[PDB]
Amino acid sequence: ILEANKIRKSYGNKLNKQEVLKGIDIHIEKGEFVSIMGASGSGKTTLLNVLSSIDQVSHGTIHINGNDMTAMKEKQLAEFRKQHLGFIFQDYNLLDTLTVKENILLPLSITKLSKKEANRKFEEVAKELGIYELRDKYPNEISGGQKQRTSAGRAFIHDPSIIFADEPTGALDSKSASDLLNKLSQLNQKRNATIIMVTHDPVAASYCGRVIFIKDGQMYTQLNKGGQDRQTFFQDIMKTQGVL
Amino acid sequence: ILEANKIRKSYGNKLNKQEVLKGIDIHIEKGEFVSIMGASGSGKTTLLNVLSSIDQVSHGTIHINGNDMTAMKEKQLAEFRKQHLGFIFQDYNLLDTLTVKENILLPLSITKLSKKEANRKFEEVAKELGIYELRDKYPNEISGGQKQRTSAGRAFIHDPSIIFADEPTGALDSKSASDLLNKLSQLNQKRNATIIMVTHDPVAASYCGRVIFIKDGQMYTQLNKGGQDRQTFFQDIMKTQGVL
Amino acid sequence: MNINQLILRNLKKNLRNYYLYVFALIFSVALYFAFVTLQYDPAINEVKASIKGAAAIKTASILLVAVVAIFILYANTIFIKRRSKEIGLFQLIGMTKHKIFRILSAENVMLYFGSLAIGVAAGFSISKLVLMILFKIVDVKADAKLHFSEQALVQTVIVFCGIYLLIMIMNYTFIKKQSILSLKKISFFQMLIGALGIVLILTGYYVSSELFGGKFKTINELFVAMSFILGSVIIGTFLFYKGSVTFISNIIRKSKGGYLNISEVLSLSSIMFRMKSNALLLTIITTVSALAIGLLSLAYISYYSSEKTAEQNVAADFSFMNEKDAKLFENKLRESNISFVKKATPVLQANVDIANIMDGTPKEMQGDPGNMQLAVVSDKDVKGVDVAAGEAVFSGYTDLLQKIMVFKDSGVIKVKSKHETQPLKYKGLREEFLVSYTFTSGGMPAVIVDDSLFKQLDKDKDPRIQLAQSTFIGVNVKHDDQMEKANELFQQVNKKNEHLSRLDTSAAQKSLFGMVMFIVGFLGLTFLITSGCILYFKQMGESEDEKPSYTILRKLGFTQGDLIKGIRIKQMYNFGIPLVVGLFHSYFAVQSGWFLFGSEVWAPMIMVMVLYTALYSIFGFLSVLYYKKVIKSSL
Amino acid sequence: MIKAFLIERRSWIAAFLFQQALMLFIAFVDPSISFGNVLYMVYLCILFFIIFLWFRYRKETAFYKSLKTWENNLDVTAINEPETPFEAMVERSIAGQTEHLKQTAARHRLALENEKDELMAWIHEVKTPLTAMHLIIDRMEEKALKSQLSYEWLRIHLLLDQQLHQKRISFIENDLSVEFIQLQPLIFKEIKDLQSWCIQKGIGFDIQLEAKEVLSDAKWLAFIIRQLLTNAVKYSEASEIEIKSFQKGEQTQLQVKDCGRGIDPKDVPRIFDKGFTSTTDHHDQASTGMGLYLAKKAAAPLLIHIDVESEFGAGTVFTLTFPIRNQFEHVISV
Amino acid sequence: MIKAFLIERRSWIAAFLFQQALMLFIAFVDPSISFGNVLYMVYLCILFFIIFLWFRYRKETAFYKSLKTWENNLDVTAINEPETPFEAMVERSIAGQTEHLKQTAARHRLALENEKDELMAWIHEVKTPLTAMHLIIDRMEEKALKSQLSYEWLRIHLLLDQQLHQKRISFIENDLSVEFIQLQPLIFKEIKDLQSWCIQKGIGFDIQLEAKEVLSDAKWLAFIIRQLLTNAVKYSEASEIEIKSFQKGEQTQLQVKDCGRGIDPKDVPRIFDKGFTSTTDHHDQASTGMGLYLAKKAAAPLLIHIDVESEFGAGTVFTLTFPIRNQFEHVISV
Ligand SMILES: CCCCCCCC/C=C\CCCCCCCC(=O)O[C@H](COC(=O)CCCCCCCCCCCCCCC)COP(=O)(O)OCCN
Ligand SMILES: CCCCCCCC/C=C\CCCCCCCC(=O)O[C@H](COC(=O)CCCCCCCCCCCCCCC)COP(=O)(O)OCCN
Ligand SMILES: CCCCCCCC/C=C\CCCCCCCC(=O)O
Ligand SMILES: CCCCCCCCCCCCCCCC(=O)O
């Protein structure tokens, strides 16, 4: 579903150039829960930015759903960004003058889906992340664990192609993180929707199927898991990290 | 540097009187990063008021750099705080009509020192923090993170001893907050200067070296870290806040 | 660094941001200069009417300076409050308070005095135009000249210096006391208070729609009604801003579910929450705009009907009381080469009773129903109707009477003679007057009786209430021609101003109401400008408080076009509510008592309201620009 | 685009209309100024303003339109001559950019031929010891070792000459000439050059020549002869290569025929492609495959039609259709 | 810039001033209109027009001032955001030109990379027949001709190895590796590579290794020592080379002392320059001279300092000053 071919990007201030991509090439098929991790000073966050449309590419080719966007006009590029490509941010990005239902129905208001269809779709989404009991609650009354699930429920409402999650489980305890990832993985299982996630918590990355170890703009192979127990893959990624 | 002994804040407005402060003892030394975090309604801002001499102190014996602050008039206290302390606010205070360099150099433009060494100090501080390319710009074409970094650098230029600081992360997103905390922790090692943050989110205080918990006053229950990994320590901080 | 360049950069930044403040200062200084110059201009003595002439211009000046002073004081107390951060920072750096006062008060004495110097120099250019505008309305033929009138220069310098002293005193207190170095569900109460506003607004309207009706018919039972209506409507407005906006908006929000557009999230997230914070301001704006529109509309309505009421108060082009004066005027006209159609008609005055014909209430007496004074004329004199015995026909319309005195169809009319009473019946009501108002008392019509009964009425001659002159000698004129020589002949005929002319009773009313309408129009313009500036200066803070919201909304893909498209409707709602409430107040103020003034409405009132709205919408149009400038820089 | 011009000057038309309104108002108020005359003057001035507006638009919207035509058009000089000082700035900016781009292109190409010339110098430096290698090879006695060394010498020597020709074809356009050639001595010398090849592999030759004169450049068709001969030689083994050169019509045809494996019919159209190599036998992988592509590249300017008639399992027949002699009159005349 | 604005809008500032003059002429002869009462209209209109021009000038002459300030030096984004249609057309033109220039630069870079890759393919394709050459050669029994072909093969090998070292030093920067190496196997391999040539020149080797470990890269230091040894040997004839390596303090020091002609003291500091050729002996023309330049440019990442103490007519003492091991702590750890 994703096709990248030697995409270039150099961070510079018009006088000194600091290259950070060094020959990447990634292929993704539909319905895989891929994870990207490795180091701290590497360009994995810049990788996640450049795979989406937020950052313009120096030299390369990007094919999403067959369509091409490397040579694409700005207005239609923003359009394409709007009708696909759900996002999950590090920060909540909730509006405090709207309730939960209003917050996760706001982006759907442009497409003009009447009332019955939009209300039914909100019920269908919010019954499955366990927030249907908070239909009329302002954000500043509920715990920090539930607001991330609200943001995810907002991102999974118009059924896009790719979900570009950026470290969701960053400020949570064990219970909230475990619940959020269990719900996210079940949601991925039920509906065919690829999820691309950049994470640092190895237990969080344990739920994934394919792991890409970006190391200074290099592939450095990629684990593939398979049909094994969660703890076996967890210890495998432990020893792989210990290698680094 | 601060040896607090029975810190009490006077109250008694109209008829109702609340014992927000009932005697608090704090023992710190140079080269620390001690931080205090409590709950809403505990008067943490009142802790800033009693410790930073923003308002009139009521009770408590505190000595600053071996000097007691209860044995001088208002003007002497004012000169002492202006020549011996430093502050960072939650909302950055930058005059729109000036430049970044002039903003950072304004506090030193009243004592009438030589221009050369002042320029040297600004060069050093800007090079260390990382805004030196933004030397001849106005604060209306740089993002919030750069403005908060400028405000942080303003309090590091007049050679202070203790950097009091409110929560320098309330109005910032995740990346900028992480970058600012990283830079402050890095700068704490280069020169000896005690920072006593007063935050509300455990993420900011997880970078510290000591945590002090208060719920209505004398409660202590302080943590120590010692040899943690900043992740187990973060989970321990937040779980201890939750159980309390 | 050096202080001076900091001061100068601050002054440029202020001058760019507040340009409506400077425009209002220049406009106000210009108008004060113009009125004080026009007060001392000797040609102001040509305006002849009951009002003293140049004693109304002084009242206009006194009233104008109060509005200007209030606007200035309030604007500066808004301005200072937005510099609390900078005061706190300068106090924290170490520099004292008598060093901050000399920074933030040495860049207003430049802006204020520069605009004051521009205002005097641009008030010398407009005075002749103002004077000619005045002369055109009152219809005088004179010459306007361009002169400086160095009294108005002094009288402006002194006034605006005093107001500036007051501003400095008000700033010092805020700087001194701010030395601290300090860097949602509706309830039951806000439901009762919300309904009480709507209930109290309409009670005033309903009591107003009766007023001069079947009740309150007493000289001392009227002030109570007026006080009740004013108090009710004002209190209803104030409580309508503090609670009835929240009520309606809350209903509208919690009747849509959660499916909101961007227009509604931009509108209803601020109209519910910040409109209530300004309730002692929008109240004043709405009520005072209502006063301006209503007073101007009434003054204008009393201006067209001057010619009609002058033609009605005197039936003929000249009305005469003495035979010798009439004969000498006719002798003068004889060599005037003007043929005058003289007619005469005796008048008999008696009393009757038509209390049966009243369809209203017995409280509408206006005197004794059986002993009220009327004027009786013969049928041979009237050349338009030929009544018979036992029939009476009323003459004239007198629009005031139709709204107070209600007349039914034919009944029985009793004539109270000395020893007899011949019953008659009411046939119909005419519309053309026959007798000047001196004979027919206030506005009582004239009856028509048969000549046969006239031969008995003139034989009776009840000598109890008869007037001094029971004759209507009144001279007419030839076709429409040069009548000014005839008029001046008339004024040289009479030296005791005891003779009435059609051309002179239609000039005093025109002059008086033209002067009133001129003054009221200029004060209304000044208030419009100042109110627009004040309402503009608060949207600035409202916009800067929603800067974070724009940033968050722009990470979800929304582009600047949609944000500005929502801001347009938000500004429409923010600027249209006070105007609509004011327009409703003004319409219900004009319609209650227009008949007391003239006989024409909906011609003047529509154009007055259109002018007000068209000149008021500019300030609403000018705020979307500031919202755009804020939106762009919140990436 | 009239809408664009009108939205350009929407601030001057408003000023003119405000002037008209003020001039009428101050005339209506006065009792000395007659209203009718001023009204008539306004009527006759609003009519002339329309004509002025039309003329100004027609003159004014041309320079920007021309450059907007140029923004994607092939020609570059389509921009008009600026007249007003607000067009000199735009012209100067665009002139600066269009000079800078050409400077950059010139510098890049210059560096290119610089590195190519360095490569050629190194290549000739490499050539000289191989002439030394030939003198040493010619100074040997043992038959088998000398034969093997000569075989390998021929392999590396044909490879280096192939590289020489494929870098000279980069500027072939600057090295064009026409000369008369004798074919039999050159053919005999080339056959004697490959003596070790035929001694080791036992390849025979049948000579049947009817045409002797051709009209083209010496070196270029000479290397064409080498490349075709080497192709046939490497694609044949232990076969009598029957060379047939006859004047078929007015065009000389160097029809070479061999009794070797030939070329597969599916790959016959693809022999002239760039980098094409035969996959039937593993011995053809050592061949670069550039020879046929460069031969096709250098044959088109010389009007030599390479008619290929290759049969798999029997041999490959290359028909070198030389250009007509009369067709060179235009080239010689010009 | 006031002059530019007053000359650009030449006709609009006269299309207004014609009307005041027309009114002041029609109000001079017609008796129904006065003069001192039309001077007022003229005065008010002039005031409005003057203020309108002042407020128009600043808003109109801003984009072009920005364009002039940017020019073509730097800050390509310095131009202000367009507001009017004509500015939008200019902005589209500028953006199109810049985009086209970027495309041309990228295509030039890709073409250069393709050329370098093709050169890589060719050099490998000519390296392999050299291995075939070696395997075929290593079978004879003669001595003099064997040695002859041997060292000419060796010089071909060294020139090809030089071109390979050039291509790899084109991107050496991304192939750093620091670890302990044993100098004795490297020296033995270098001597073995020169066994036949040293025997021909009759120069022995005296190896004394007091130091054991060095901390640098293998291949670049190996080739540097290789070319230094070749230069030293070709500076000598039938002389014994004194190779002494001793651990002077904390650093390894390799001294190669020879008894040949040496280097002139004036030319001792100038041996590392570009394109140095010795005209004293005609046999020195075979030396490329670029090997020393590439060795000295590749010594900077290796931090190895080359010390030379050569006297003409006495010999050359090539000394290598290996950096201290402690100096590599800031490199290996970071
Ligand atoms: C009775 C006598 C009546 C006379 C009335 C005439 C008074 C009107 C005159 C002058 C207004 C004085 C205050 C405005 C001048 C200050 C504005 C200024 O200088 O700011 C400059 C820009 O000015 C502006 O932004 C405002 C542009 C409009 C000018 C003011 C318009 C005046 C009339 C509009 C008011 C409408 C209300 C009318 C209601 C009836 C600098 O801004 P910049 O963003 O830095 O751009 C720089 C260009 N590269
Ligand atoms: C609250 C509403 C705010 C509106 C403010 C608009 C201007 C306020 C000023 C003056 C009020 C004028 C009264 C309204 C209309 C009066 C109607 C009237 O007088 O009738 C006729 C109208 O003629 C006039 O009086 C001219 C009235 C023009 C009023 C001035 C309008 C613009 C005022 C702006 C001047 C000051 C600002 C200076 C800035 C450049 C006169 O009699 P006639 O039927 O033409 O016959 C004469 C001989 N044949
Ligand atoms: C009450 C009358 C108001 C008009 C006053 C006339 C005096 C001239 C005032 C200045 C005009 C300045 C407007 C120029 C800004 C841009 C013009 C536009 O966009 O239309
Ligand atoms: C009676 C005539 C009324 C005329 C009303 C319009 C006056 C001109 C309005 C334009 C001036 C302000 C627009 C630009 C301001 C800005 O962008 O800063």
mmCIF file of N, CA and C in Angstrom, chain B residues 47-114:
data_model
loop_
_atom_site.group_PDB
_atom_site.id
_atom_site.type_symbol
_atom_site.label_atom_id
_atom_site.label_comp_id
_atom_site.label_asym_id
_atom_site.label_seq_id
_atom_site.Cartn_x
_atom_site.Cartn_y
_atom_site.Cartn_z
ATOM 1 N N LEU B 47 3.828 28.583 47.653
ATOM 2 C CA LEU B 47 5.201 28.176 47.939
ATOM 3 C C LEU B 47 6.196 29.041 47.179
ATOM 4 N N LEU B 48 5.933 29.314 45.900
ATOM 5 C CA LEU B 48 6.807 30.241 45.184
ATOM 6 C C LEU B 48 6.834 31.597 45.872
ATOM 7 N N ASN B 49 5.670 32.078 46.303
ATOM 8 C CA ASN B 49 5.596 33.387 46.937
ATOM 9 C C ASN B 49 6.423 33.435 48.218
ATOM 10 N N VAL B 50 6.346 32.388 49.043
ATOM 11 C CA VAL B 50 7.083 32.406 50.304
ATOM 12 C C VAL B 50 8.580 32.227 50.060
ATOM 13 N N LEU B 51 8.958 31.431 49.055
ATOM 14 C CA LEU B 51 10.376 31.184 48.810
ATOM 15 C C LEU B 51 11.029 32.230 47.911
ATOM 16 N N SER B 52 10.312 32.749 46.917
ATOM 17 C CA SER B 52 10.900 33.679 45.961
ATOM 18 C C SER B 52 10.780 35.136 46.382
ATOM 19 N N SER B 53 10.177 35.414 47.536
ATOM 20 C CA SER B 53 9.970 36.780 48.024
ATOM 21 C C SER B 53 9.148 37.618 47.047
ATOM 22 N N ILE B 54 8.262 36.972 46.283
ATOM 23 C CA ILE B 54 7.319 37.721 45.458
ATOM 24 C C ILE B 54 6.372 38.525 46.337
ATOM 25 N N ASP B 55 5.849 37.904 47.389
ATOM 26 C CA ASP B 55 5.043 38.592 48.382
ATOM 27 C C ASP B 55 5.836 38.708 49.679
ATOM 28 N N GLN B 56 5.187 39.236 50.710
ATOM 29 C CA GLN B 56 5.831 39.391 52.006
ATOM 30 C C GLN B 56 5.858 38.054 52.733
ATOM 31 N N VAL B 57 7.043 37.666 53.206
ATOM 32 C CA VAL B 57 7.179 36.409 53.928
ATOM 33 C C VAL B 57 6.593 36.554 55.326
ATOM 34 N N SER B 58 5.945 35.491 55.797
ATOM 35 C CA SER B 58 5.271 35.497 57.087
ATOM 36 C C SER B 58 6.006 34.684 58.143
ATOM 37 N N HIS B 59 6.361 33.438 57.839
ATOM 38 C CA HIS B 59 7.048 32.590 58.801
ATOM 39 C C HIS B 59 8.030 31.690 58.068
ATOM 40 N N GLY B 60 9.004 31.193 58.811
ATOM 41 C CA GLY B 60 10.010 30.296 58.268
ATOM 42 C C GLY B 60 11.384 30.940 58.274
ATOM 43 N N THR B 61 12.398 30.141 58.599
ATOM 44 C CA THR B 61 13.786 30.587 58.626
ATOM 45 C C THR B 61 14.502 29.985 57.424
ATOM 46 N N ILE B 62 14.824 30.827 56.447
ATOM 47 C CA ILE B 62 15.504 30.403 55.231
ATOM 48 C C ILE B 62 16.733 31.278 55.037
ATOM 49 N N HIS B 63 17.876 30.644 54.804
ATOM 50 C CA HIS B 63 19.117 31.346 54.518
ATOM 51 C C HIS B 63 19.537 31.066 53.083
ATOM 52 N N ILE B 64 19.942 32.116 52.377
ATOM 53 C CA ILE B 64 20.308 32.029 50.970
ATOM 54 C C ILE B 64 21.803 32.289 50.856
ATOM 55 N N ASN B 65 22.540 31.282 50.383
ATOM 56 C CA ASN B 65 23.997 31.349 50.253
ATOM 57 C C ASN B 65 24.647 31.716 51.583
ATOM 58 N N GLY B 66 24.101 31.170 52.666
ATOM 59 C CA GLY B 66 24.565 31.489 53.998
ATOM 60 C C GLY B 66 24.050 32.795 54.556
ATOM 61 N N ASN B 67 23.198 33.506 53.823
ATOM 62 C CA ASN B 67 22.671 34.795 54.245
ATOM 63 C C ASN B 67 21.179 34.666 54.513
ATOM 64 N N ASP B 68 20.755 35.070 55.708
ATOM 65 C CA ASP B 68 19.339 35.068 56.043
ATOM 66 C C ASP B 68 18.633 36.215 55.334
ATOM 67 N N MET B 69 17.422 35.944 54.852
ATOM 68 C CA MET B 69 16.637 36.922 54.112
ATOM 69 C C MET B 69 15.632 37.664 54.986
ATOM 70 N N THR B 70 15.672 37.462 56.300
ATOM 71 C CA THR B 70 14.739 38.096 57.221
ATOM 72 C C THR B 70 15.360 39.253 57.995
ATOM 73 N N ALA B 71 16.512 39.760 57.561
ATOM 74 C CA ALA B 71 17.249 40.775 58.308
ATOM 75 C C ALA B 71 17.629 41.949 57.413
ATOM 76 N N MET B 72 16.686 42.416 56.599
ATOM 77 C CA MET B 72 16.904 43.620 55.806
ATOM 78 C C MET B 72 15.557 44.219 55.429
ATOM 79 N N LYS B 73 15.606 45.452 54.932
ATOM 80 C CA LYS B 73 14.412 46.169 54.518
ATOM 81 C C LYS B 73 13.950 45.685 53.144
ATOM 82 N N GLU B 74 12.927 46.355 52.609
ATOM 83 C CA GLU B 74 12.371 45.951 51.321
ATOM 84 C C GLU B 74 13.354 46.206 50.183
ATOM 85 N N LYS B 75 14.023 47.362 50.190
ATOM 86 C CA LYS B 75 14.968 47.681 49.122
ATOM 87 C C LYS B 75 16.168 46.742 49.131
ATOM 88 N N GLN B 76 16.680 46.410 50.318
ATOM 89 C CA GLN B 76 17.808 45.487 50.397
ATOM 90 C C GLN B 76 17.415 44.101 49.899
ATOM 91 N N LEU B 77 16.213 43.644 50.255
ATOM 92 C CA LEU B 77 15.722 42.379 49.720
ATOM 93 C C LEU B 77 15.587 42.446 48.204
ATOM 94 N N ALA B 78 15.126 43.587 47.682
ATOM 95 C CA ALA B 78 14.967 43.738 46.240
ATOM 96 C C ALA B 78 16.307 43.663 45.518
ATOM 97 N N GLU B 79 17.316 44.370 46.022
ATOM 98 C CA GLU B 79 18.624 44.297 45.380
ATOM 99 C C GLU B 79 19.211 42.896 45.499
ATOM 100 N N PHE B 80 19.001 42.235 46.644
ATOM 101 C CA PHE B 80 19.508 40.875 46.812
ATOM 102 C C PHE B 80 18.878 39.914 45.811
ATOM 103 N N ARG B 81 17.555 39.978 45.640
ATOM 104 C CA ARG B 81 16.915 39.091 44.675
ATOM 105 C C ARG B 81 17.296 39.444 43.243
ATOM 106 N N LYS B 82 17.523 40.726 42.945
ATOM 107 C CA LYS B 82 17.876 41.082 41.574
ATOM 108 C C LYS B 82 19.314 40.695 41.238
ATOM 109 N N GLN B 83 20.202 40.631 42.230
ATOM 110 C CA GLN B 83 21.592 40.289 41.956
ATOM 111 C C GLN B 83 21.949 38.857 42.328
ATOM 112 N N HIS B 84 21.010 38.075 42.866
ATOM 113 C CA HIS B 84 21.356 36.756 43.375
ATOM 114 C C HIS B 84 20.400 35.645 42.941
ATOM 115 N N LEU B 85 19.242 35.968 42.367
ATOM 116 C CA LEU B 85 18.248 34.978 41.973
ATOM 117 C C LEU B 85 17.965 35.063 40.479
ATOM 118 N N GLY B 86 17.228 34.074 39.989
ATOM 119 C CA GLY B 86 16.753 34.081 38.617
ATOM 120 C C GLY B 86 15.410 33.390 38.525
ATOM 121 N N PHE B 87 14.605 33.821 37.560
ATOM 122 C CA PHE B 87 13.245 33.325 37.423
ATOM 123 C C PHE B 87 12.948 32.941 35.982
ATOM 124 N N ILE B 88 12.074 31.950 35.827
ATOM 125 C CA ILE B 88 11.488 31.574 34.548
ATOM 126 C C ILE B 88 9.993 31.430 34.764
ATOM 127 N N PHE B 89 9.204 32.039 33.896
ATOM 128 C CA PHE B 89 7.761 32.037 34.056
ATOM 129 C C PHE B 89 7.117 31.012 33.135
ATOM 130 N N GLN B 90 5.898 30.615 33.496
ATOM 131 C CA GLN B 90 5.140 29.694 32.657
ATOM 132 C C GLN B 90 4.825 30.319 31.308
ATOM 133 N N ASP B 91 4.419 31.586 31.306
ATOM 134 C CA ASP B 91 4.166 32.333 30.080
ATOM 135 C C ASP B 91 5.333 33.283 29.853
ATOM 136 N N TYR B 92 6.084 33.032 28.787
ATOM 137 C CA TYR B 92 7.245 33.839 28.446
ATOM 138 C C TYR B 92 6.889 35.307 28.255
ATOM 139 N N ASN B 93 7.723 36.177 28.817
ATOM 140 C CA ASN B 93 7.538 37.624 28.766
ATOM 141 C C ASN B 93 8.635 38.192 27.875
ATOM 142 N N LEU B 94 8.318 38.390 26.601
ATOM 143 C CA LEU B 94 9.236 38.995 25.650
ATOM 144 C C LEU B 94 8.578 40.203 25.009
ATOM 145 N N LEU B 95 9.262 41.341 25.065
ATOM 146 C CA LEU B 95 8.747 42.553 24.452
ATOM 147 C C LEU B 95 8.794 42.408 22.941
ATOM 148 N N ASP B 96 7.671 42.688 22.282
ATOM 149 C CA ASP B 96 7.604 42.483 20.840
ATOM 150 C C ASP B 96 8.485 43.467 20.087
ATOM 151 N N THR B 97 8.740 44.634 20.668
ATOM 152 C CA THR B 97 9.423 45.701 19.956
ATOM 153 C C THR B 97 10.937 45.550 19.945
ATOM 154 N N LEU B 98 11.490 44.571 20.651
ATOM 155 C CA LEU B 98 12.930 44.408 20.733
ATOM 156 C C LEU B 98 13.382 43.222 19.887
ATOM 157 N N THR B 99 14.680 42.943 19.935
ATOM 158 C CA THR B 99 15.274 41.795 19.266
ATOM 159 C C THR B 99 15.595 40.715 20.287
ATOM 160 N N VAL B 100 15.924 39.529 19.776
ATOM 161 C CA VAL B 100 16.270 38.412 20.650
ATOM 162 C C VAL B 100 17.512 38.746 21.468
ATOM 163 N N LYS B 101 18.544 39.268 20.801
ATOM 164 C CA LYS B 101 19.768 39.646 21.495
ATOM 165 C C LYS B 101 19.505 40.737 22.523
ATOM 166 N N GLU B 102 18.713 41.745 22.155
ATOM 167 C CA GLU B 102 18.405 42.813 23.098
ATOM 168 C C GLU B 102 17.557 42.304 24.255
ATOM 169 N N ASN B 103 16.636 41.375 23.992
ATOM 170 C CA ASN B 103 15.855 40.786 25.075
ATOM 171 C C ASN B 103 16.753 40.086 26.081
ATOM 172 N N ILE B 104 17.689 39.268 25.599
ATOM 173 C CA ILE B 104 18.542 38.547 26.536
ATOM 174 C C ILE B 104 19.521 39.491 27.224
ATOM 175 N N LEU B 105 19.892 40.596 26.579
ATOM 176 C CA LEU B 105 20.881 41.501 27.153
ATOM 177 C C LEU B 105 20.286 42.642 27.975
ATOM 178 N N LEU B 106 18.966 42.827 27.956
ATOM 179 C CA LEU B 106 18.361 43.966 28.644
ATOM 180 C C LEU B 106 18.668 44.000 30.135
ATOM 181 N N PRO B 107 18.592 42.897 30.887
ATOM 182 C CA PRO B 107 18.898 42.987 32.322
ATOM 183 C C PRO B 107 20.293 43.499 32.628
ATOM 184 N N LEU B 108 21.250 43.334 31.719
ATOM 185 C CA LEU B 108 22.610 43.804 31.948
ATOM 186 C C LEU B 108 22.853 45.216 31.433
ATOM 187 N N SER B 109 21.843 45.874 30.867
ATOM 188 C CA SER B 109 22.024 47.191 30.271
ATOM 189 C C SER B 109 21.689 48.324 31.230
ATOM 190 N N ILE B 110 21.698 48.063 32.535
ATOM 191 C CA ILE B 110 21.390 49.092 33.520
ATOM 192 C C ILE B 110 22.587 49.278 34.445
ATOM 193 N N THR B 111 23.350 48.210 34.660
ATOM 194 C CA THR B 111 24.509 48.277 35.542
ATOM 195 C C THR B 111 25.719 48.932 34.885
ATOM 196 N N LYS B 112 25.677 49.159 33.571
ATOM 197 C CA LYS B 112 26.709 49.895 32.839
ATOM 198 C C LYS B 112 28.087 49.244 32.991
ATOM 199 N N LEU B 113 28.226 48.075 32.379
ATOM 200 C CA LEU B 113 29.495 47.371 32.275
ATOM 201 C C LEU B 113 30.054 47.529 30.865
ATOM 202 N N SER B 114 31.263 47.007 30.667
ATOM 203 C CA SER B 114 31.891 47.066 29.355
ATOM 204 C C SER B 114 31.096 46.249 28.344
#
